[PDB]
Structures are given as structure tokens and as C-alpha cells.
Amino acid sequence: DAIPVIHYIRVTDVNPGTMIVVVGEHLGGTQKVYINDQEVSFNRNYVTSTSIILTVPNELELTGQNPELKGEIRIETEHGVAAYNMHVLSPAPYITRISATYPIKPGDQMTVIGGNFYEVQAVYLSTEQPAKDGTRPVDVQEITNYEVNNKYSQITLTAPANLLEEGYLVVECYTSSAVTEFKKNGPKPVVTAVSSTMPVVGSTVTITGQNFIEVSRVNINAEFDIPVGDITTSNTFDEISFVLPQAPTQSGHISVTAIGGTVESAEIFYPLENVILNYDGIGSHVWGDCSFVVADGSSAPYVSNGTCLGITGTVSASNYWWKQSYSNAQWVNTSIIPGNIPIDDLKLQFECFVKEVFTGPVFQIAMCENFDAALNGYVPVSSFTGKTETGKWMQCSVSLSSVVADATYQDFLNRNSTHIGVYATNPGSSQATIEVYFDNFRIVRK
Numbered sequence: 001d002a003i004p005v006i007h008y009i010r011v012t013d014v015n016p017g018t019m020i021v022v023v024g025e026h027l028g029g030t031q032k033v034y035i036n037d038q039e040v041s042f043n044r045n046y047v048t049s050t051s052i053i054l055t056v057p058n059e060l061e062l063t064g065q066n067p068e069l070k071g072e073i074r075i076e077t078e079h080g081v082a083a084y085n086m087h088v089l090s091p092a093p094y095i096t097r098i099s100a101t102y103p104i105k106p107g108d109q110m111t112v113i114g115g116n117f118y119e120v121q122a123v124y125l126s127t128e129q130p131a132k133d134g135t136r137p138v139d140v141q142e143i144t145n146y147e148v149n150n151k152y153s154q155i156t157l158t159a160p161a162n163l164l165e166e167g168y169l170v171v172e173c174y175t176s177s178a179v180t181e182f183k184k185n186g187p188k189p190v191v192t193a194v195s196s197t198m199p200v201v202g203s204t205v206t207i208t209g210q211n212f213i214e215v216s217r218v219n220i221n222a223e224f225d226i227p228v229g230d231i232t233t234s235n236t237f238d239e240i241s242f243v244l245p246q247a248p249t250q251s252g253h254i255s256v257t258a259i260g261g262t263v264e265s266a267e268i269f270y271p272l273e274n275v276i277l278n279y280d281g282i283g284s285h286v287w288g289d290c291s292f293v294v295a296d297g298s299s300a301p302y303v304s305n306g307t308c309l310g311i312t313g314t315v316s317a318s319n320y321w322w323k324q325s326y327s328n329a330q331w332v333n334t335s336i337i338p339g340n341i342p343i344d345d346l347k348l349q350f351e352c353f354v355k356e357v358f359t360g361p362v363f364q365i366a367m368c369e370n371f372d373a374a375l376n377g378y379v380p381v382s383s384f385t386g387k388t389e390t391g392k393w394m395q396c397s398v399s400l401s402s403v404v405a406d407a408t409y410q411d412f413l414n415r416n417s418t419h420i421g422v423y424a425t426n427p428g429s430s431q432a433t434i435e436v437y438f439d440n441f442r443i444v445r446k
């Protein structure tokens, strides 16, 4: 006859799976228990006239994921009914990333991506992060227009006026708050790779990276800029290319300016001070059956930096002495590459042009008359693509140790020989015809 009552609950906020104690009166004869409008099992033995002990089910459907559910525990006795409000906590929100079209202008739509976006109370931008208490920084930029999707995984919102340039985006939920970095212009661009360190004038330079968005400047070694209209950028914003209109007269790096900022290439671009043979005053050819060409725009490698070496013709099968160039190199000064640098930390680079792929013919590269240490059976391949490119120039790169057996660069220098040699042969079973050009042999750091 007495009406059941609930005075309080001991452990109003509660996690699924945890034990609770319902304290009140006239509860001795509870028949049924419910939480969030869902039937919950309980044990009769933990029931007294003044207390119910049960555990909030782990798999209980929460009010966070279904707004139709009343956030209360309901008790039914033999005759009466009692209810008390309590909040079973949803999992904490997290933010993976922001999906946006940069730059973000006020009023533009962006999408916050993450999970457990239950019970979103507020969304704001801030120059600094909220406290671990969820305590919210002094100055913030409230985002008034936002919508959460049905999966509680995405918040689509519109950008406020007077946008923060840099800082954080915060999703404020009942359980806690989630934070991620926010930049209205997006992340700084990045450079992964460059097609070459010494591309031939008139040929294509290609740059790999990310966030090449609205590229406004490409600066070469702080000497000159590429006219923006002559810069092609890929749809996916991860590749830049352009024709090199002139040779730099000083080494440096390539700087790329995009919406997200400016970034420099890591490699040194046009390391003229690292060149050892270019057939244009650095080093010199001495003897050998080969050719030397200045490209004329209509044939051969079409373009060239001054004179370049040519090894062309048809090679009989099993020809172990065909065409070659024996030259005197001008090794890199120690002012640039210190004597104590290991050979293992150095690489030989050169520009190569292959008219057409071939099968059988190979190249030998030798230095300082140490043919024991020479590079043998080498087929030119691009350091950029890994393939044997044809009909255009490519950068070829090999570890210097594959040509030099010495330990440090000074040991190499102590041989006091300026010999560099390129030898073409055909150990192949079938004859073949080739047309290959070489220029700008250079030694640089790995």
C-alpha cells in the first residue's frame, strides 16, 4: 500500500557496467527494474526495504545515441512505481581530422571527422587548448551553425566570421571535450622529392609532395622565380612541374609557397660546386671512341647544358671493348666535401638520356684507374621513377662506394689520379643498337 520512493543513488553520472545502490523506501518487493526505458536484470537477494543493489548493463542503449529514451531508473514494486533521474555516460568523443577545402573563408563549410559525437553541447575555435578539466580557454570563437550526422561520426559546420588563423577546434560533449589543430589555411606544404639536382635547361623539373594548394611562388636558389602561369600542379595537390627556363649560377634550394605556407627542398639544387665533369671547362675528355654533341633542338638529346658525351651506334654481340670515354675529372674540393667524409655517405650523380631501351649493352664507370672497384654491368635508370626513361633526360644516381673502394673521401683523393672513365660494352647474346648521352657528373652527399 505504501508508495515506493527513491532518495538518491550511490556509486548522478554513471558509466555502463558499474555497480550502483538505489536508496529509498518501500522497495522490499520490487518485481521489475528499468534503466533508460530498458528492462534490467537484478538479484532479489540484494533487495531490502531501503536498498536495491544492481549493476548498470554494459550493453545498455544510452540516451546519447537515442533521444527517445528517458534518462531515469524506474522501479516497480508489487503495487507502486518509483523513478529517479540518472545519466548513463556515453563514450568520450575524439577527433581524427578536419575535412576542408583550403583556404577556409568565413561561411565556408567544413567537416569534423571522428567518433562518439554524442550529446554535442558546443563547438568552438580557440588559440589555445582547453584544460584537462574541460575548462574552456579565456577567448573562443563559437561555432553556432553545426549538424551531427546519424552515425555520430561527423560534424558538418559553417566557419565563423573573423576566422582564427591558427589554433584549435574543440567539440564539447557532455562526457568530455575533443580537440584537434585548426589552421584556416591548412597544413604547410611538404616536398618529398625532386626529379633532379641538375636538370638540363629546357627540360622538365618535377616536384613531389603534399598540400600544393594555390601555389603562388616557386623560387630557385634565391636567384629567380618561375612565372606562376608556367607552373603545372596536379589535381591531387601532390605534384608540381615546370620547364627550367635558365641555369642557376649559384647552388641553393627550391622554395615552394602555397596557401599553407612556404617550404624548401632538402637536397641542394644545382650543386655546381660538386660537378667533376661537364665537358664545358670542368674536367676534360682525353681519348676514346665516342662523340661529343651540343644539342640543336631537332635531334640527339634535343636540349643540353653545353657539350655532352655521346655513346651511340650498333654493338655486335659479345663485344667487350666497343665505345668509351677516358676523361680527367676535377674532384670536389675538400672545402665542400671534407676529407673525413666516408665514401659510404657519398653518391655519384649524372644526367643521362636514352633514346630507346636496349637489351645486352651495359656501362662501366671507373675512377682513379682502380678497375677492381669499378661499377660494372650498369644499365641507366632514373633515381626519380626507378625505370629506364626514354626520349628525355633523367638523373642517374649510384652509391660512390660502388665505384670507389676507399674508406673516406681523403683516402680516395690520396690516390692522386683524376681518371674517370665510362665504357660501353655488349656481353649480350644478341646484337643491339643504342643512343645514350651523359653530362654533369657530380659527387654529392647522400
Ligand SMILES: OC[C@H]1O[C@@H](O[C@H]2[C@H](O)[C@@H](O)[C@H](O[C@H]3[C@H](O)[C@@H](O)[C@H](O[C@H]4[C@H](O)[C@@H](O)[C@H](O[C@H]5[C@H](O)[C@@H](O)[C@H](O[C@H]6[C@H](O)[C@@H](O)[C@H](O)O[C@@H]6CO)O[C@@H]5CO[C@H]5OC[C@@H](O)[C@H](O)[C@H]5O)O[C@@H]4CO[C@H]4OC[C@@H](O)[C@H](O)[C@H]4O)O[C@@H]3CO[C@H]3OC[C@@H](O)[C@H](O)[C@H]3O)O[C@@H]2CO)[C@H](O)[C@@H](O)[C@@H]1O
Binding pocket: 286, 287, 288, 320, 321, 364, 371, 423
Ligand atoms: O667480362 C670479362 C670478359 O673480358 C674480355 O676481355 C676484354 C677485357 O675485359 C677488356 O678489359 C680489354 O680491354 C682492353 C682492350 O682490349 C684494349 O684494346 C685497350 O687498349 C687501349 C688501352 O687500354 C689504352 O691504354 C690506350 O690509351 C691511349 C690511347 O689509345 C691513345 O689514343 C691516347 O692518345 C692521346 C694522348 O694520350 C694525348 O696525350 C693526346 O693529347 O691525345 C691523344 C688522342 O688523340 O693516349 C692513351 C694513353 O693511355 C695512357 O693511360 C692509360 C695507360 O694504361 C696507358 O698505358 C697510357 O699510355 O688506348 C688503347 C686503345 O687500343 C687501340 O689500339 C690497340 C688495339 O689493341 C685496340 O683494339 C684499339 O682500340 O685497353 C683495354 C684495357 O681495359 C682497361 O680499361 C677498361 C677496363 O675494362 C679494364 O679493366 C682495363 O684493363 O679487352 C678484352 C678483350 O678485348 C674477355 O674477352 C671475355 O671472355 C670476358 O668474358
Ligand SMILES: [Ca+2]
Binding pocket: 278, 279, 280, 305, 306, 307, 308, 439, 440
Ligand atoms: Ca655539359
